[PDB]
Each structure stands twice: as structure tokens, then as C-alpha cells.
Amino acid sequence: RTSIEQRSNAVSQVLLGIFSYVRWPKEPAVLQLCVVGPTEYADGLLRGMVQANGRRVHAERRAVDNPDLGTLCNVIYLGVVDERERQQVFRSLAGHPVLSISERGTECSVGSMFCLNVGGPRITFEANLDSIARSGVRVHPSVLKLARRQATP
Amino acid sequence: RTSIEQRSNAVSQVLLGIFSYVRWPKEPAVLQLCVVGPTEYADGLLRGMVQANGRRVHAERRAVDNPDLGTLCNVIYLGVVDERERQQVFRSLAGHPVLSISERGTECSVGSMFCLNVGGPRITFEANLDSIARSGVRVHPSVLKLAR
């Protein structure tokens, strides 16, 4: 079984790997990532990140009921939230170009664009076409090369 | 800095405060703090702390299903865990002097020497007098005056 520090640094990459298939309508110089809700595997993230084009990914935690998640966040890494809390969040992102990703794989069905599954020998994820289309960012299809080859032994 | 960081740095401060009213059977040079489960406010802790008496608190995440929590852990800061996992956790803590604290002081009760309530303008916390005796650490009773 893979350790917490193993799975953290792993998530870090998968997110970078997802972020590669994503175009924002207006590309910021610093991409803004907001961690929202309790999380296990975001420690790696919050160090900050750099993309393969040198764009820094800046990372900070934000309150689930923060009403400006939408404008503060180009990315949101979503943790454990309850129905209401989840509602607040996905409402705040509407009309804004935001990439949403969950630590847990249940949430594709309720708002998140991507849903990690961190258990097992590899980090896997599934996606949802609905939330993706209404996201207002462009997601290249080949983002699924990554989940599939991750669901591979 | 955001309010989550603000509330995070404060959980730091509250944790230290509680630490001063606890003693362990055999005091370790370096206090082992296990953050366990999803945690909105444990980022200050993970950065590492130090007590006024100069002692270092080392903090690191450990998985919920981790069977050696009891030996690996001086203090455990319990995040989000379901009924099954909550049990799983406290069984490893059994018969070991482990200071148990929880981030959500509502859906918490079994174990959890202390349950924090981070919401509101300040951080508050209950104390679980039952859990406090069984645990195996010596908690000074003054601490209850810092409770609710």
C-alpha cells in the first residue's frame, strides 16, 4: 500500500497532467488553484507548482462558503463536502472559467469536472461531460489517455 | 492571507496551548504528531511546531488504516472519518498514551480527548472527560477552564 506522502506527490503530478489538456479563454500569468474543504492529498499541491511552460501554479486553501471562489480560482481542488456545502461551491463557480477536481471519486456526479480515485497502486480519475461543458474552459479529450493508462497495470 | 490560513494558524496556537497541560508517561525528546484523515486546518501543524519549553513537535500525515498509529503517535489530530474508520483508528490508539484531538467537534465523541469547533469568530473546544482518563496521558485539569 502506497503512503500518504507517496500519494500526495502523485496527485501533484496528475493534476499537472490534467492541467495540460486545459485551455482557459483568457490565460493568466499565474494560474490560481484553490483547495476547498478538508483534504488528505493536497499537501503536495499547496507547496505551489510549476507547469512545463514555466507558469507557476499558486495554491491556497479557501473557505467552502467563500462566494468569490469563482473569480479567485482558475482551478479548484475539492475535498470532502456535504450536500449543502457542495451546492454553495458549485453555485459560486457558475459563469466562470474554472477547472474543478475532486480528491474523491464520488463527486463527478454532482459538480466536479474530474474525480480522483487515490486508492490502489495508481491514482486514477474519471470525468463528467456535463460539468466539463458548462465549465467554460476547453478540455482536450486526450486528457483521458492519462486516466486510462493510470488504470492500467 | 486567507481566513482558512488564519484559522489554520490559530489551530496551531490552540494545539500548543493544550499541549502545555499534558504529560506523557515517558517524555519524548520530540513530540510525534500524526495528522490523520481529511483536514481543512492542519497546514500550520504540518509546518512543524515548537513548545515554549523548547521541545519540537514533528507533524506528518499518516493514513487512517495505519495499524501502528498507537506507537508512531504522541498526539493525533483526527480529521474526517466515518464510523468504521473512527473505530479502526481508536483501536490502534488503545493502551498507548496518545493525545487525541478532532477537527470537527460535532460528529465526534468516541475517543477524541478534545473536539475543536473552528467555526465562529474564535476556535472553541469541548473536552471528553471519559476519553481523558482511559487514554493513558496525564492531563492537567486547568485545561477544562479553556474548554466550553
What are the DSSP calls for B1-45, one per residue? --HHHHHHHHHHHHHHHHHTTEE-SS--SEEEEEEES--SS-HHH
Do residues A125 and A14 lie in contact, with contact meaning Cβ atoms separated by under 8 Å? yes
Q: What is the rounded CA–CA span in Å between residue A92 and residue A90?
A: 5
How is chain A split into domains, by residue range?
1-153
- Closest of B97, B47, B89, B107 to residue B71, by C-alpha: B97
Chain B nearest-CA distance from A133, in A, is 29
In sequence order, what are the beta bridge partners of A35?
A: A61, A77
Q: What is the rounded CA–CA span in Å between residue B128 and residue B30?
A: 26
Residue of B nearest to A3 (CA): B63
Contact A38 B5 (CB under 8 A): no
Pairing of strands B99-102, B114-117: parallel
Q: What is the rounded CA–CA span in Å between residue A32 and residue B134?
A: 46
Contact A37 B38 (CB under 8 A): yes
Q: What is the rounded CA–CA span in Å between residue A113 and residue B87?
A: 33
Q: Does B85 touch chain A (CB under 8 A)?
A: no
Do residues A30 and A53 lie in contact, with contact meaning Cβ atoms separated by under 8 Å? no
Three-state SS sequence of chain A: CCCHHHHHHHHHHHHHHHHCCEECCCCCCCEEEEEECCCCCCHHHHCCEECCCCCEEEEEEECCCCCCHHHHCCEEEECCCCHHHHHHHHHHCCCCCCEEEECCCCHHHHCCCEEEECCCCCCEEEECHHHHHHHCCEECCCHHHHHHHHCCC
Do residues A89 and A36 lie in contact, with contact meaning Cβ atoms separated by under 8 Å? yes
Experimental method: X-ray
Annotated binding residue B140: yes
B33 phi and psi, to 5 degrees? -110, 115
Q: Does A43 touch chain B (CB under 8 A)?
A: yes
Q: What is the rounded CA–CA span in Å between residue B18 and residue B33?
A: 13
Contact A3 B63 (CB under 8 A): yes
| CB < 8 Å to A38, chain B | 37-40, 79-80, 103
Q: What is the rounded CA–CA span in Å between residue B142 and residue A8?
A: 39
Residue in the block written with cell 492542519: B42
Q: What is the rounded CA–CA span in Å between residue B105 and residue B41?
A: 13
- Closest of B49, B76, B40, B74 to residue B61, by C-alpha: B76
Sheet holding A49-50, edge to edge: A49-50, A56-62, A31-36, A75-78, A99-102, A114-117, A124-127
Residue in the block written with cell 488528505: A40
Q: What is the rounded CA–CA span in Å between residue A87 and residue A112?
A: 11
Q: Which helix (H) or strand (E) holds B126?
A: strand B124-127
Contact B40 A103 (CB under 8 A): no
Contact A63 B38 (CB under 8 A): no
A89 phi and psi, to 5 degrees? -55, -55
- Closest of B65, B42, B68, B56 to residue A1, by C-alpha: B65
Do residues B101 and B117 lie in contact, with contact meaning Cβ atoms separated by under 8 Å? no
Cβ contacts from A onto B, under 8 A: 50
Q: What is the rounded CA–CA span in Å between residue A115 and residue A96?
A: 20
Helices then strands, each counted (H, E), chain B: 5, 9
Q: What is the rounded CA–CA span in Å between residue B10 and residue A148?
A: 42
Q: Does B79 touch chain A (CB under 8 A)?
A: yes
To what resolution in angstroms was this structure determined?
3.2
Contact B4 A62 (CB under 8 A): yes
Least CB-CB distance to A43: which of B3, B8, B61? B61
Residue in the block written with cell 506522502: A5
Q: What is the rounded CA–CA span in Å between residue B40 and residue A39?
A: 6
CA A26 to chain centre: 19
Do residues A75 and A33 lie in contact, with contact meaning Cβ atoms separated by under 8 Å? yes
In sequence order, what are the beta bridge partners of B124?
A: B117
